[PDB]
Amino acid sequence: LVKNKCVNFNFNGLTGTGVLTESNKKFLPFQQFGRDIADTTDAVRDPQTLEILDITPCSFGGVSVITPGTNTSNQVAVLYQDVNC
């Protein structure tokens, strides 16, 4: 198991892509993975060590270019629209 970086994963056949992290969720002993209000997986129980993991996506939206206008200058700034640098 590797955590805090984007990976493909498969736990016991439950398959996906995302950043796995340690979790505060408390599954009952028979429950094996968790879902949100939109019915998509967001948590999983590790089959080896029975600890709870969160899942989070890897797809992060716009890149936007900020310009003085080319009449004024050719230098620019760039916005990564939802990213922690």
Binding site: K25, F27, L28, F30, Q31, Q32, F33, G34, R35, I37, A43
Partner: peptide, 11 residues
């Protein structure tokens, strides 16, 4: 009875 092995909460 719990119909599935899925954790769902406050829902």
């Amino acid at each position: 009875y719990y119909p599935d092995k899925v954790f769902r909460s406050s829902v």
